[PDB]
């Protein structure tokens, strides 16, 4: 089971009973890839403390293009497969995917499209992550996992990628929908980025707004297909056309995409550059902010 449209977000309930049953291992991968911003939360640290039983850390730090100038830019095929067999991961096993953000989802979704831009499909988000998982009792440990190395494979998916080339033509040929799910005020330009030095504010031109932390619930739980839908729908984004999403470094953009593909459309690409790239690579003629002119 790999699917049209495979399972996108599994459950604590199901989490649990698979640990329980013995079922973590070759076949099944459960992956921790929490991020925070430096002086805030340590990820790693949370992990070696309490994780859930076989988890394994994923580190997005080490995941990627060190040699770009760029944040967290996707790693070549070699780069993500020698790092996910080193994880016990195989082309045939179902990877599970999690953070401990507090809103539920933050990193996860990164996880998840990375895994299929690179050929995999069967891969999951915990629904209500982490927090979820404590929330309700579920088995933790900091005991040591040492997952058996395995060998991937990967493959690009150049479709459902984006570079600054092709959202630069995207400019003129209007072909795909740009959407941003930054703060508000971040894609407004009223708040400055974080974490840069010199980093303007503000958006591509012609992108929408649609703030990651509106796809979730006040528990941090996914919203449900219907609410999903109408959301795209109050903001005019339609899930017949295509559809790019960006974010600041192509990290929440991710959760556009998965809030499509539970829609039914998996093929929404992601610009990984973002804004960030962009700020940097194209004339500001082509973004706005509500400031700086």
């Given at each position: 089971?790999?699917?049209?449209?495979?399972?996108?977000?599994?459950?604590?309930?199901?989490?649990?009973?698979?640990?329980?049953?013995?079922?973590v291992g070759p076949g099944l991968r459960v992956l921790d890839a929490s991020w925070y911003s430096p002086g805030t939360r340590e990820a790693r640290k949370e992990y070696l403390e309490r994780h859930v039983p076989g988890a394994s850390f994923f580190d997005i730090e080490e995941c990627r293009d060190k040699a770009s100038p760029y944040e967290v830019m996707l790693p070549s095929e070699?780069?993500?497969?020698?790092?996910?067999?080193?994880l016990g991961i195989s082309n045939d096993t179902h990877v599970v995917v999690y953070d401990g953000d507090d809103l539920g989802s933050f990193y996860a979704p990164r996880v998840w499209?990375?895994?299929?831009?690179?050929?995999?499909?069967?891969?999951?988000?915990?629904?209500?992550?982490?927090?979820?998982?404590?929330?309700?009792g579920h088995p933790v440990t900091s005991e040591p996992?040492?997952?058996?190395?395995?060998?991937?494979?990967?493959?690009?998916?150049?479709?459902?990628?984006?570079?600054?080339?092709?959202?630069?033509?995207?400019?003129?040929?209007?072909?795909?929908?740009?959407?941003?799910?930054?703060?508000?005020?971040?894609?407004?330009?009223?708040?400055?980025?974080?974490?840069?030095?010199?980093?303007?504010?503000?958006?591509?031109?012609?992108?929408?707004?649609?703030?990651?932390?509106?796809?979730?619930?006040?528990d941090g739980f996914e919203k449900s297909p219907e609410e999903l839908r109408a959301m795209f729908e109050a903001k005019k984004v339609d899930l017949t056309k295509p559809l790019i999403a960006t974010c600041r470094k192509g990290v929440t953009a991710?959760?556009?995409?998965?809030?499509?593909?539970?829609?039914?459309?998996?093929?929404?690409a992601i610009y990984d550059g973002s804004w960030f790239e962009w700020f940097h690579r194209a004339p500001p003629?082509?973004?706005?902010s509500q400031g700086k002119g």
């Amino acid at each position: 089971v790999h699917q049209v449209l495979y399972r996108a977000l599994v459950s604590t309930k199901w989490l649990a009973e698979s640990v329980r049953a013995g079922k973590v291992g070759p076949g099944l991968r459960v992956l921790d890839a929490s991020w925070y911003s430096p002086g805030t939360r340590e990820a790693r640290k949370e992990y070696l403390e309490r994780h859930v039983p076989g988890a394994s850390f994923f580190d997005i730090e080490e995941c990627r293009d060190k040699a770009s100038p760029y944040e967290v830019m996707l790693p070549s095929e070699a780069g993500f497969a020698d790092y996910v067999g080193s994880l016990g991961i195989s082309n045939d096993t179902h990877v599970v995917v999690y953070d401990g953000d507090d809103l539920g989802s933050f990193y996860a979704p990164r996880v998840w499209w990375m895994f299929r831009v690179f050929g995999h499909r069967t891969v999951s988000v915990l629904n209500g992550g982490f927090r979820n998982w404590l929330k309700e009792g579920h088995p933790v440990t900091s005991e040591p996992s040492r997952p058996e190395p395995a060998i991937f494979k990967a493959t690009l998916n150049r479709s459902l990628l984006k570079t600054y080339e092709q959202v630069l033509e995207n400019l003129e040929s209007k072909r795909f929908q740009l959407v941003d799910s930054r703060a508000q005020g971040r894609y407004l330009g009223t708040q400055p980025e974080p974490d840069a030095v010199g980093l303007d504010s503000g958006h591509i031109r012609g992108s929408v707004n649609m703030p990651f932390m509106n796809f979730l619930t006040e528990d941090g739980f996914e919203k449900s297909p219907e609410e999903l839908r109408a959301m795209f729908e109050a903001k005019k984004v339609d899930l017949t056309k295509p559809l790019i999403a960006t974010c600041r470094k192509g990290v929440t953009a991710c959760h556009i995409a998965l809030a499509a593909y539970l829609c039914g459309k998996p093929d929404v690409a992601i610009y990984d550059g973002s804004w960030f790239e962009w700020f940097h690579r194209a004339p500001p003629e082509t973004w706005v902010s509500q400031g700086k002119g």
